[PDB]
Amino acid sequence: MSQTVGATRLAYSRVWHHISAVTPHPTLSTIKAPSEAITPPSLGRLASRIATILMGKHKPIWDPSTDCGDYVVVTNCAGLYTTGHKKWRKTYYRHNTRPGSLQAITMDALMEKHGGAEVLRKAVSGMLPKNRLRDKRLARLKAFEGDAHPYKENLVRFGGKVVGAPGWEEAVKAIREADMERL
Amino acid sequence: GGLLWKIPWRMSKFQKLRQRRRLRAVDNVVATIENALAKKGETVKAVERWRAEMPTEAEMLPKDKYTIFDRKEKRYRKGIHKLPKWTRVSQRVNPPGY
Amino acid sequence: MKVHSAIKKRCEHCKVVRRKANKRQNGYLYIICPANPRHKQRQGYR
Amino acid sequence: SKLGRTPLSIPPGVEITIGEPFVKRDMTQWKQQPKRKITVQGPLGQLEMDIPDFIKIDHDAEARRATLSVANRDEKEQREMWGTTWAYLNRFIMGVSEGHTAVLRLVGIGYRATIDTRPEKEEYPGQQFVCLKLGFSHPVEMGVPKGMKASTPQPTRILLEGINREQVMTFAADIRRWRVPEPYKGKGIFVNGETIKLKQK
Amino acid sequence: VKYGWSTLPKRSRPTRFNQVTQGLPAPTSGPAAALKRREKTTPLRTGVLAVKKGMTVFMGRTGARIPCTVLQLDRVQVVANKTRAKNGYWAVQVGLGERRAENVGAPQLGYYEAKGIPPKQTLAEFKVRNQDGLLPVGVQLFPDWFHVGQVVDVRGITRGMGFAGGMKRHGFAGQEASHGNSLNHRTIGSVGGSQGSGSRVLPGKKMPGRMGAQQHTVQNLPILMVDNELGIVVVKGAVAGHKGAVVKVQDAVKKAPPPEEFVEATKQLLNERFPDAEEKLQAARKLHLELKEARRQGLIDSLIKNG
RNA sequence: GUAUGUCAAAAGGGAAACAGCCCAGAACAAGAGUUAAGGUUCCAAAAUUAUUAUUAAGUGAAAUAAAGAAAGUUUUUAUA
RNA sequence: CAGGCUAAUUUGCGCAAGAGUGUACAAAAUGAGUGCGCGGUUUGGCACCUCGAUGUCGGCUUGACUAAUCCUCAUGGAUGCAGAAACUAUGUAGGGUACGACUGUUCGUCGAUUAAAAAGUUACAUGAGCUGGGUUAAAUACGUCGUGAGACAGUAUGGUU
RNA sequence: GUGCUGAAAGCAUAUAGGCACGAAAUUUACCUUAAGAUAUUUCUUAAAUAUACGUAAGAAAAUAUUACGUUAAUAGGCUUA
Numbered sequence A: 001m002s003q004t005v006g007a008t009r010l011a012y013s014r015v016w017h018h019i020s021a022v023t024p025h026p027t028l029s030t031i032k033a034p035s036e037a038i039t040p041p042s043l044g045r046l047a048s049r050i051a052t053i054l055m056g057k058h059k060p061i062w063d064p065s066t067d068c069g070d071y072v073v074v075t076n077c078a079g080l081y082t083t084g085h086k087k088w089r090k091t092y093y094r095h096n097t098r099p100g101s102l103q104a105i106t107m108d109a110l111m112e113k114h115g116g117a118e119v120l121r122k123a124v125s126g127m128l129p130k131n132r133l134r135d136k137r138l139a140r141l142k143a144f145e146g147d148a149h150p151y152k153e154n155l156v157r158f159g160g161k162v163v164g165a166p167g168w169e170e171a172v173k174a175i176r177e178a179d180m181e182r183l
Numbered sequence B: 001g002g003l004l005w006k007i008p009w010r011m012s013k014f015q016k017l018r019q020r021r022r023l024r025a026v027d028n029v030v031a032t033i034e035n036a037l038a039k040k041g042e043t044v045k046a047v048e049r050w051r052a053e054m055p056t057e058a059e060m061l062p063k064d065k066y067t068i069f070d071r072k073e074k075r076y077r078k079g080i081h082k083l084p085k086w087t088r089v090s091q092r093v094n095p096p097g098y
Numbered sequence C: 001m002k003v004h005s006a007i008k009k010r011c012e013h014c015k016v017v018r019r020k021a022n023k024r025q026n027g028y029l030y031i032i033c034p035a036n037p038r039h040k041q042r043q044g045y046r
Numbered sequence D: 001s002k003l004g005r006t007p008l009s010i011p012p013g014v015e016i017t018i019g020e021p022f023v024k025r026d027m028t029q030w031k032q033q034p035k036r037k038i039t040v041q042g043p044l045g046q047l048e049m050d051i052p053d054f055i056k057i058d059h060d061a062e063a064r065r066a067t068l069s070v071a072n073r074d075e076k077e078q079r080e081m082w083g084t085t086w087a088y089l090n091r092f093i094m095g096v097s098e099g100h101t102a103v104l105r106l107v108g109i110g111y112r113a114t115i116d117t118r119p120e121k122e123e124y125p126g127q128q129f130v131c132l133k134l135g136f137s138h139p140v141e142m143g144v145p146k147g148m149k150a151s152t153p154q155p156t157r158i159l160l161e162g163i164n165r166e167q168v169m170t171f172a173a174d175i176r177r178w179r180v181p182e183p184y185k186g187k188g189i190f191v192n193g194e195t196i197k198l199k200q201k
Numbered sequence E: 001v002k003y004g005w006s007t008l009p010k011r012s013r014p015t016r017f018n019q020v021t022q023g024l025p026a027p028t029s030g031p032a033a034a035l036k037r038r039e040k041t042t043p044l045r046t047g048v049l050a051v052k053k054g055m056t057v058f059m060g061r062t063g064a065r066i067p068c069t070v071l072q073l074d075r076v077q078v079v080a081n082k083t084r085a086k087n088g089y090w091a092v093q094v095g096l097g098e099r100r101a102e103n104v105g106a107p108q109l110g111y112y113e114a115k116g117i118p119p120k121q122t123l124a125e126f127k128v129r130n131q132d133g134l135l136p137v138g139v140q141l142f143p144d145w146f147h148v149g150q151v152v153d154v155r156g157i158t159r160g161m162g163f164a165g166g167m168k169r170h171g172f173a174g175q176e177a178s179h180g181n182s183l184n185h186r187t188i189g190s191v192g193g194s195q196g197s198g199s200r201v202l203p204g205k206k207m208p209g210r211m212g213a214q215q216h217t218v219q220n221l222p223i224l225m226v227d228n229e230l231g232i233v234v235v236k237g238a239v240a241g242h243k244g245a246v247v248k249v250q251d252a253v254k255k256a257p258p259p260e261e262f263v264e265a266t267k268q269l270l271n272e273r274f275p276d277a278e279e280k281l282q283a284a285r286k287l288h289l290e291l292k293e294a295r296r297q298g299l300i301d302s303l304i305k306n307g
Numbered sequence F: 001g002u003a004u005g006u007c008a009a010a011a012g013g014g015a016a017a018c019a020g021c022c023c024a025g026a027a028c029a030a031g032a033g034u035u036a037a038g039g040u041u042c043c044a045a046a047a048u049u050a051u052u053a054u055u056a057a058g059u060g061a062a063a064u065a066a067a068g069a070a071a072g073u074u075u076u077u078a079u080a
Numbered sequence G: 001c002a003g004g005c006u007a008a009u010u011u012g013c014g015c016a017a018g019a020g021u022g023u024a025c026a027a028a029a030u031g032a033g034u035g036c037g038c039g040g041u042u043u044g045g046c047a048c049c050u051c052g053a054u055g056u057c058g059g060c061u062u063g064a065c066u067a068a069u070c071c072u073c074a075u076g077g078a079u080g081c082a083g084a085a086a087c088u089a090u091g092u093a094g095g096g097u098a099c100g101a102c103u104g105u106u107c108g109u110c111g112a113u114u115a116a117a118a119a120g121u122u123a124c125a126u127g128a129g130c131u132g133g134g135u136u137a138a139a140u141a142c143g144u145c146g147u148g149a150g151a152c153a154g155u156a157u158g159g160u161u
Numbered sequence H: 001g002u003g004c005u006g007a008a009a010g011c012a013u014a015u016a017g018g019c020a021c022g023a024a025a026u027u028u029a030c031c032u033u034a035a036g037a038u039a040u041u042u043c044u045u046a047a048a049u050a051u052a053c054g055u056a057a058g059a060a061a062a063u064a065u066u067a068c069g070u071u072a073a074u075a076g077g078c079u080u081a
């Protein structure tokens, strides 16, 4: 029981993560060679990763009942990477229980009214548990079409270097070497 | 029929893998029983029949590991998983030609 | 135009082509013939 | 391709300027393929185009030749564009020096054609409008795209001229779309010696 | 979703961050996209608020008899303009009539205080195509705002019919009268199909209910007469509502706008009848602060009894 | 009718939901215990695990629609 | 009775092949006897649900949906597309498809208009919305059958919705 | 359904690639209802405002909606046309 005794303030805090839908991802890409052929994370492979963060499942204290999820700011959703002809052949449906009122729309036609952010919210929404926390978690996914967003100051940092920045890894290893100078 | 017995016509790579290991585990049971008798200079009519008219997993074709003969099918072949107790039964040889 | 399921060349000038294939549909196989316009055929419905 | 290997004989006066690989940022796409801007200047004008980067041009300024080649012939995408990029450059070279022409013949009683100016519909200052009387209750008038010269040596004969073949042959197709040749009397608009086999009766 | 294909929360405001100057495709939805697909149909000028006074016929000098509805304008003024930068669209707020100060609330008393306009009876916005349609604040619009022969659209609330049945509300045929019919003469009959159709009454089913008292637009009504003295604008045909009800009269959306000369001449008449429409407004806006700052401090009673 | 099993009188895991099918026979608790069928990107416990080919049709991915057509594509065997 | 399973069969269709018709010429039209199928609208087969209760043929009222299209819109082929009209076929279901005589009738026949006066599913949609002419109770008669009481996908008049 | 350029495949080809024509269907437009961001150099320190009551109504099954209440033409009466 001692493992849990302590200050759990920072274990439950909301971290503001960031990812660009255009930056190549060696881990979430199916093409891994050559270096120039690596593609960004596909729609479903990016949503599968985000849904894991919104559920807080990346934390060692995850519990499905506690809403220990985090925020995820997705940028460049206009350049959402998709394979095949999904952009023009995939269809989204709707019905309000009135016979004949079946609304259909393609991915590209849906990206003209509400942009690529709406296509990613539907992918993440289906990957989340269908319960009373689905709308709270999906609201923590802030997707934008370009590189601009109001959370450029919220993104988690480490020594002034935003995570995902060019030199963010060096700033982390420098802070841990200073923490070892103690009993 | 209106009663749904949802059984796919083919097996998955996970079922085929376990099938390979079951065909491989029965080969070790006959090889152990045969080598144990050979050391004593003995033989069993059932063990001599198996080694004579039954192949090993390393000698069977893929179509004999995941399929069986069925005269009611278009091409006289039927998924082995469509056999009763197919997981605890021996089935490796089909009629010649089919 | 005669829409068939088994399109065949009826002369030496008939040509097999796949038209109307774009990012939204797969298209159909046509039998275009400049000599005789009665050799026009299609494979598939919309 | 057997056409891409054929060198492109650059006649006197023509000047080919091969740019360098570039990539225009497209927010809708994650990775644009590099292209090369090729400028073909000469006496009649200047044409341009952007070819893929996998196509390599060996511009031989000494013997006035330019051979095309791709990085991999096993790829269907590179084999196709190899011959297509060659066909377009051929039309550019032979279009900026000599020019492309198209002749339209108007068959049918009462069919005429004259070149006039309609300032009320001028898409640009000094646009020529080909007036066509093809039996319709209303007058048919079409403005020549910027860069084409239209003339009518005779009432039943139009002569289009331009450095871009795609623009010349496309405008002639818009005129012919008003009266397609019929098989019973040959009435219509024939483009570049087009013919139609008439019927018996 | 709640409304449409949008799964976005209702309290987030990401619009300003999805800009087109950044290289993105122009969205198909939104105010800008909505204003672009309505530019051909949006009128150029504003409208006026009139009161339906009755119905008559217009007699021509050669033997023409034309039915028409008489609409009267009662001190119609321009109260405020809506700009695309502050409100997201172009429009003009127009007034009608007057109202006692005691009945007007303090929120609206200060709304008219900062404009120099007496309290009005009603207000309504009339969309315009561009900023050229915005008019000075406080100028009165007379029947000459339109010209004889001009086509307009008259909007108004229809006559209330109360709880209506199936015949008067949906034109149902009813049932038999004497051939054995039993207690079902004006009833609706069946309300749907059996189990195979949902085991439920489908949404949108036409049933009895309240009828009328809704807005109704009559389009393409020519202007037969225009009288500045009487203040009337005679339009052809009928108009929704009762006598003494306010209506909205504006140029037709399905017709080409009036000639460019007329649109300018009318704008030039507002500057003659009201040479100083901004000076009176700036003076009114300046007084609002002086009184507004007095209400804050609490010394308003001193300014009232200043002289 | 016959042969074998289950259900009936059998819960539990898998087959989306499931009397009869694939596993397995519930006396009660504990365990990142060991396994069967079955599975391992997310809903949802576990591989976005390695190797070689094929498909570009979202074909297909846990209920194979037929004969048949065709410069779709790949391999192999001939052959110029 | 309706639903379910099935699909022999149908008053529902398609694809393949091509004897033959088309003055000529297989595939403009036409398509013997067949083969491979879809579909679930007919007559059946089974008897799985309901007999401590699922009201039934037509009509009226009010719908919703399918598309294998009668009209309207775009359009390919047509020795057999001169024009016009029409035939055939590909798109396409937004709207419309009315009136009257006969019959309980669905259906069908017929009169006269019309751009046209096409169909089907929904418990052969809808009787705790209506009607009750038919079918199917007690009464009575005719014919037929039975020795008789009586019976009859035989016919009549009447009959608590 | 009909085209232009044009190769893979020296040709051909409206096949790849680059452009385009085109229907009572669709979408937009137009009309109504809903939605309620937002706007006003708007109001409020215990209020602004709203309701109740009374006279009513462009409203009306109840409810609600929309005006008025003496510094007042809301309803009735009265006078005139």
Ligand SMILES: [K+]
Residues within 6 Å of the ligand: E199, E200
């Ligand atoms: K219900």
Ligand SMILES: [K+]
Residues within 6 Å of the ligand: none
């Ligand atoms: K699928």
Ligand SMILES: [K+]
Residues within 6 Å of the ligand: none
């Ligand atoms: K009687």
Ligand SMILES: [K+]
Residues within 6 Å of the ligand: C019, H001
């Ligand atoms: K075509």
Ligand SMILES: [Mg+2]
Residues within 6 Å of the ligand: B002, B003, B004
């Ligand atoms: Mg079932």
Ligand SMILES: [Mg+2]
Residues within 6 Å of the ligand: E160
């Ligand atoms: Mg009333």
Ligand SMILES: [Mg+2]
Residues within 6 Å of the ligand: E173, E174, E175, E176, E177
């Ligand atoms: Mg009546």
Ligand SMILES: [Mg+2]
Residues within 6 Å of the ligand: E181, E183
């Ligand atoms: Mg009565």
Ligand SMILES: [Mg+2]
Residues within 6 Å of the ligand: E198, E199
């Ligand atoms: Mg239900």
Ligand SMILES: [Mg+2]
Residues within 6 Å of the ligand: none
């Ligand atoms: Mg029993």
Ligand SMILES: [Mg+2]
Residues within 6 Å of the ligand: none
């Ligand atoms: Mg069990």
Ligand SMILES: [Mg+2]
Residues within 6 Å of the ligand: none
């Ligand atoms: Mg599963």
Ligand SMILES: [Mg+2]
Residues within 6 Å of the ligand: F032
């Ligand atoms: Mg474990």
Ligand SMILES: [Mg+2]
Residues within 6 Å of the ligand: none
């Ligand atoms: Mg997991």
Ligand SMILES: [Mg+2]
Residues within 6 Å of the ligand: none
């Ligand atoms: Mg033709």
Ligand SMILES: [Mg+2]
Residues within 6 Å of the ligand: G094
């Ligand atoms: Mg429409």
